[PDB]
Symmetry: D2
Subunit: 454 residues, 4 copies
């Protein structure tokens, strides 16, 4: 058995929502009322201790309008022959599946109007098809649906867990321990989890991620999160980086710590983001962008990428290079990897002349694929012509020639990436941070901020 989707037609703030499901569902977002009402909708469907009180006047969409509450759950009855849960579900629902080739099962919840005697009268029905459902029989206080499912609710037979906000008064090491227990152990086969803590998502895999949007109207996006076998050795940094970005509205994907130093200085001088959200800065280095981009795109989070046009030399060869920075953006657009170029160079001196020759090659590569660069710019993908250091020289190069006594200030900062960046940031003023922010090669910061003039 595998939960597929739940449709809630009328509830406290749900109107016609459909949320795709899996086993191991996780819900998060700004709307705490929507997450609480999602868990209470599950409790009304599958827990008798909540269902026995019926529906009140307050638990309709408007308080006297659209008096038909429907909650329907899809179950995917077709499975393997050897699993116990499918057969133990089928053995209770006898007259349900009229055909033995039935693949989909439905558990429905109907409600009467609240005007009659100030009561709701929840009525439950199964059936293997949406039309022609039949009633769930029960002799007394107990339904036949209660014989199959058990619901355990946590707040500080087939078993479904509902964990609400377990990080309250909890140290972060115990949150990481609970994350490992939730997503690795076989005890929690079916659960629904709501949280605000990114430390509960450091170990996460084969889970359905549900994001509830910031609006008062409940909007839900669902993504089926898997980590494939290629990223198994870099899974921990990937999950630790992405878990804090899941709680953001706007995420800028950058390479390393020196870009974070520069962008945090520029943002602290321009907009300290006490008025704004203050979206996330995400460090992505050594991998491709497709995993983060599909995860954030299916969840409704806007993704901004600034990258450099790198030329990676091949291993064990001479004079051949890969178009890695172009290939990552082409993989983002869904294209295939380009062929490798061959660069023939004399020896001469190999210190400083080779970087100039490679920079000229990067310039003419940037000239060749300008249409693909415009297609990257159609999305929020920003590919530098050579490197971000050259863009910084094109923005604030007079200040860089003032601070650094060398005739060129680029190579002095390339020769020590982290240490010289702090020296430039220390001697950096308010005027030229705005010069960086207003430049046309730093529009990624403008998209990350997302400012409105008024």
């Amino acid at each position: 058995m595998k939960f597929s989707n739940i449709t809630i037609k009328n509830f406290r703030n749900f109107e016609k929502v459909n949320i795709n499901l899996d086993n191991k569902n996780v819900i998060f977002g700004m709307n705490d009322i929507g997450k609480t009402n999602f868990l209470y909708a599950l409790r009304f469907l599958l827990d008798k201790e909540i269902r026995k009180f019926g529906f009140n006047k307050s638990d309709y969409h408007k308080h006297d309008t659209s008096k038909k509450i429907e909650i329907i759950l899809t179950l995917d009855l077709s499975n393997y022959e050897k699993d116990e849960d499918t057969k133990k579900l089928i053995s209770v629902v006898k007259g349900a599946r009229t055909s033995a080739n039935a693949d989909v099962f439905y558990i429905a919840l109907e409600s009467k109007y609240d005007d009659k005697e100030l009561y709701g009268n929840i009525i439950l029905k199964w059936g293997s098809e949406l039309d022609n459902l039949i009633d769930i029989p029960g002799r007394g206080n107990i339904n036949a649906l209660d014989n199959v499912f058990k619901v355990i609710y946590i707040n500080p037979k087939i078993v479904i867990y509902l964990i609400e906000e377990p990080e309250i008064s909890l140290h972060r090491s115990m949150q990481i321990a609970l994350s490992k227990q939730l997503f690795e152990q076989s005890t929690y086969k079916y659960f629904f989890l709501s949280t605000h803590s990114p430390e509960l998502l450091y170990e996460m895999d084969n889970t359905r991620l549900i994001r509830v949007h910031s609006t008062e109207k409940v909007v839900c996006s669902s993504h089926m999160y898997n980590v494939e076998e290629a990223y198994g050795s870099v899974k921990k940094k990937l999950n630790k980086a992405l878990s804090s970005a899941l709680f953001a509205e706007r995420v800028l994907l950058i390479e390393g710590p020196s870009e974070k130093i520069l962008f945090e200085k520029v943002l602290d001088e321009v907009e300290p983001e006490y008025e704004l959200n203050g979206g996330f800065l995400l460090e992505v280095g050594g991998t491709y962008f497709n995993h983060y981009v599909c995860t954030l795109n299916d969840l409704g989070i806007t993704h901004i990428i600034k990258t450099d046009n790198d030329l990676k030399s091949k291993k064990g060869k001479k004079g051949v290079y890969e178009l890695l920075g172009l290939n990552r953006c082409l993989n983002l657009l869904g294209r295939e990897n380009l062929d490798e170029i061959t660069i023939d160079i004399p020896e001469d001196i190999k210190g400083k002349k080779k970087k100039e020759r490679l920079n000229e090659r990067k310039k003419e590569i940037f000239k060749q694929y300008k249409n693909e660069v415009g297609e990257f710019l159609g999305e929020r993908i920003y590919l530098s012509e050579i490197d971000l250091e050259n863009d910084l020289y094109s923005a604030i190069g007079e200040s860089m020639k003032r601070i650094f006594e060398n005739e060129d200030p680029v190579h002095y900062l390339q020769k020590s990436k982290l240490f010289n960046m702090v020296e430039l940031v220390n001697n950096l003023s308010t005027k030229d941070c705005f010069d960086v922010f207003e430049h046309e090669k730093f529009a990624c910061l403008k998209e990350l901020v997302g400012s409105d003039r008024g």
Copy 2:
């Protein structure tokens, strides 16, 4: 007026504790009962709503032993021009202090025995000296101490705020907003704050940090946290890095993301629960170590440093280099910076021979200062001879020659730091990570784990 220290001579789980204070005090740690009882001790000293109920039997260290509760607060009254709160404390407390030469002031709490009549009878006294205190006069239900101080308690006249766990059911952007309001606005002049969330400490300055140790016996370490004017341009990254490290037991200070990739691969193969038991990896890049080390040392957190012997060339000068990797560790040991050396290198080729000459000079430098290196190993400071890549080649170099078709994998892995390290991690087995973990040049990982063979 500035709070200096509070001494609690007998209370429900305190024995003889003495905690130094400031304005803007922050308390954190594993022992939640100790933090709650610290806030209750402050409420018993300064809040009449807690004093009017008196002391029970349970408000004692052992439930009958050493029945004399003393809570004494030191104030350091006399300033000349600093504030108006000193004068409004003088004008009410005219009795014991008359001369302006008295600089130190005391507010003392005493309790009677609970053996007979089942009551505590909290008695309060002021006085400018520890001997010869005099009673606080009060005509009815109200003391004269209540005219000076006001206490506001938050849980989800001179004014003192007591905020207990404000991050409960709170999104992390609002935690950052509350941190900025707590440590930048002038509304919260005096407060005591307890928290589990690192997002409430992204903006912190001029504050007293109190750490409560993991033991059942209450041990408190207090540090006066300031950020000086040199680190003002890198303050936000530094605070964001240090706030998560404040909630750990063992912290390893590393340089950048390549070290993090390699070390989390090695740790995930060897001990995948290092974050559960209190380990943390801290990226420190572009600054000196002393600001992190003094903060972690005064709070009782063990600090481990893994660094490389770098040569830093100056700006505008040719042939002179800085012994910066030695200089950071010498600054950690409280010593002055070494003088700059001169290296004479001919024209030749600048690519590969220059690196070999610099590595040879680093080997001679490492041989010259071996006594200082042994003193660095006396503390938890680990300085490599050349680089981490050479130590990795000394550990798993046959594996690196197997993965990489180049005969020298050190140069190939140093051409692209981030992408080639992910490639090495991808084709890495369980046998290689134990070879890295058991090597003598990677004892920092053993100190971070904390396991001792003998």
Copy 3:
């Protein structure tokens, strides 16, 4: 429809109890737990707010023994023209009862075992006969039984009221007002009432009185209380006298205030705690005893009768007298009244000789009917030979000659019944009251106390 009886086959202190019912049921007694659980048994039968929680482990007679709870209510459904409630019960319960020849109708409750899964699972069934009951159909949270009956519970569709202890913090005039509203108004057609206050019973008629016995085992006696049209002009005195006697264990029925004054003096000298242990003195004068005796006998209260052999003259006729004192006891034994006698007395003097002739006639009538006197003594009926004053002279006559200067104290004490008896009580000692108490003509006091020597 008229409530007939309820049988509770297993409940938290009921074993096989069977209580006859009517409309307007009143329950009282020492066992407060039994009254509370009687009202809870009614709530478990007829209220969905109590049924929806089911049965616990504590809702059983012994906590594991005889796990089959049955609560069955009989209704005597079929009338021809009496009310409209019968037709509105037929119209919903069309299934089991179709013919109009079925006069008796049943509402049955059954419960499952609480051994496994910790639930009771109350199951309800109707049917016009005890065998072959059928289930009550209900589509959702609501039964078809809930459509007919409504239950309103008071504690400081056919409607049943359940009033529990309404006299709490209530002035006694409002208790009499609630009594008049409960037993005269047509709003409370069906109710069950529990009380400790006799002021709630000053207006009672056409009601079923249920007494719960003082034992821990629940014993219930039911009496159908009516006041006939003969006692309609003295109804308020019978109700006010009997309401306080309903809360007693032993009741002595006396004539007037002289007997009460003498017996309260004697009891205050001998056993001053007769009211604490359950004794009561009831004044009955001018009526027959049968209305009190049948009510007290059906409720399990022991009744003791002390009376005098009076001769009652008729109106308008001379020389004919009625044997009223014999006739009341003969009516108590279910026998017809004796025929009138004729006494021939000459003119003579009418003051003192006439009383002696009447006393001699009373002595010879007492000699004639000694077998009937012995049968009265078989029950708790005590008939004096002439008068109580002669028995007092036969007990303490020397004391009466000492107090009163007249040689015959019987005539003097009979000239003024109230003022001379107070004079005899005033000059009375402890020795005289024990002489009255131990005399053979005052065994009614020994039966009222209840102490038996052997």
Copy 4:
């Protein structure tokens, strides 16, 4: 020590009340809020658990007007030298009584305004005189007044009990037991008791009775209730009669059960809700009226008396009679008893003519003392000329001649008091009950009803 009075000068419904006190105080009445606030005023004076919360805004007289709450208690410090409670009070109040001849002690409560800081600040002071009170010294949370007194509050050192409504869910035999314990045992030396049940007053003596009047404005009447040694043998009957009359507004004092039969039939035909509005019929026989009348007069209950002009013969002498009916009313007005009169009557036949001669003597006696009869009529005292059956014959005598076959229906009613009055009441209509009610010899019933319709 003995409590004398408590003055409450501003409280939540008290304005300037003075209530005289003794030991063993009992408070009752319609105003439940006034009794509850009287007990709260005692708790605010003498209980630290109520003083430590202070005064709110609501517990002032109006919600802002006359913000000066004063509660003062008087104690009678003069006592015998062997008394312990006086000595243990004096040993704590050291500087209180400036003279050793001080007889009166004061315990005073004062309050501050609640306009600022929203606090009451209860301040307590002793002193042996109303001017020049001094503060109660207390070092911490505890006053010196708390060392002397202990307060125990009951709701379903010198020790004061406060029992509020103990008859709730209590059987009446336990109420009589608690009454005997409260008023006979020496455990409850000091108490204040509030009740609604007359069964808690069956044993009562040496107590202060406080009645709270039916108005919303708190009016309190206090009476010192004692039973003298003359009524010690009729004490139980007297207390059982008076306890139910203490909860009434208008009380008619009648002789025996025949008058109760007649008057309660007449009231059931005329004013069926006489007891609902505060009427009560009290049987007084064989005693004088003064003990009931002084108790009801000091408590503010209106007393109505209907009595007959009886002639009682004297022991041991022939022909002398007492004017008992005149003497009881003269004792009510505070006059001495009249001398006995002598009637010389020959032997003749003493059946019927003797009663006629005695009735003629009663008529001329009624003619002699007509001025005293008018003075009795000035109060609510009604004395018949001969007897009540003669007034009944003067009212409805035609009906009595219709029912009774005798030409003289008075003597047929006199020869059997109880059975013939029931026979008259049985054959009694609505018309002649209004004839009894409207007659000028039955104005006591009109005063008993007493409805000011206008």
